[PDB]
Amino acid sequence: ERPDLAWLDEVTMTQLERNPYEVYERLRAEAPLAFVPVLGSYVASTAEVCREVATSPDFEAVITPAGGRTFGHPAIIGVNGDIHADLRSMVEPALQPAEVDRWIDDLVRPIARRYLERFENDGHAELVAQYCEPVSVRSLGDLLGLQEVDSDKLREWFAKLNRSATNAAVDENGEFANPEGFAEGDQAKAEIRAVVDPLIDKWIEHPDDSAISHWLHDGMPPGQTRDREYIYPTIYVYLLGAMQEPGHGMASTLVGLFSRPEQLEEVVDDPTLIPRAIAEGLRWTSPIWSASARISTKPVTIAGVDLPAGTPVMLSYGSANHDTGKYEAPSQYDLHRPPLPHLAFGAGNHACAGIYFANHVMRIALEELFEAIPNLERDTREGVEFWGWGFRGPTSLHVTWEV
Ligand code: HEC
Ligand SMILES: COc1cc(C=O)ccc1O
């Protein structure tokens, strides 16, 4: 469509999944708002355009097409107006900072210890599978009321939901190129229903302190609950991004710290710097890289593009967090970067609802990890592969330490 961007026609999904940064660097210089054929959508790549689209009164939330096929309605990420306000009201109580501070430490710290105890004396570990992901899912799972769902199962569900919700590739007719990729999303949803429908059955008659029970009961007239079909899409949104991203964020922070060994040493010596290390990790490899979207409600002009009403725009926050108009050498992890704003949690009315919770989950897990294994070192004989365009993180993180 845009003639000087004809090279975009040769960009593939695989290339974006394996490393999107080269394409998006060109996009930030050539076309901060650009239609990307394989994605079938306009894409916002700079911090200015992302921030503008995310906060504009001329835009409302929309779900990406593969996200919609995966989550259905009403996914909190893709609804507006009254439904959105109800769902925000539904999820916000356990995420309130004053509430998180009451219990986050007794929640996450014993969990981190239980997983650290399985390997802290081995001298080698794969931290993604053995620590980062389990701590992340076990923490949220217990908060939700999924105490009896195994870590390994929560991790399998978010991986399947991941691949389904990012199955974004379209052919030249605008149709999904790989419709089979939605099947494992459908299978994960089916397993989730078989496991969670009995829990909802119980919570409806016997409410408890689990978050999902509060989603059913909070703000409802006496004897009434929100219909399960009304809350399931948001349960799926949790069982993907809320389960996956704090694991991705702490693992990416570790990889960044390993890439700067004197900063890693500084953080191990002074664990009060862990929150600053995590914030730079989120900027350096944003866990939610390009999975949120908005849609114009009016005709709008963004970055010299005139958009008709009803135009979706994907927000590639992960690219915006490497904006060289904001940062010096963004592809380099640097703990001592000035604490500038970043977009790893989004912006506007649909900005992440779990920021305060997530930052504490990541802080505590890194605290316990560095105290258990202060001589942690990356295994230089293994490579670290980052994967993902919609959600991005390291596929594994092999480490060693002298025992
Ligand atoms: C306990 C729940 C929870 C956790 C954990 C969580 N999130 Fe959020 N996040 C949400 C919810 C709910 C939304 C949807 C907000 C909405 O659409 O109103 C969201 C939305 C987002 C968005 C989209 C915002 C936008 O502008 O469209 C981003 C980006 C995001 N989260 C990043 C993260 C990152 C990064 C982490 C972890 C490091 C994380 N999330 C962990 C609950 C969570
Ligand atoms: C916080 O969970 C999710 C967030 C997003 C934001 O774009 C997309 C899918 C998810 O499951």
UniProtKB/TrEMBL annotation:
What are the coiled-coil residue ranges? none
What is the name of this protein? Answer: Cytochrome P450
What keywords are annotated for this sequence in UniProt?
Heme, Iron, Metal-binding, Monooxygenase, Oxidoreductase
Family classification: Belongs to the cytochrome P450 family.
Where on this chain does heme b bind? 84, 88, 292, 294, 317, 347, 350, 352
Pfam families noted in UniProt:
p450
Mind telling me which PROSITE patterns this protein's record contains?
CYTOCHROME_P450
Q: Name one GO molecular function term.
A: iron ion binding
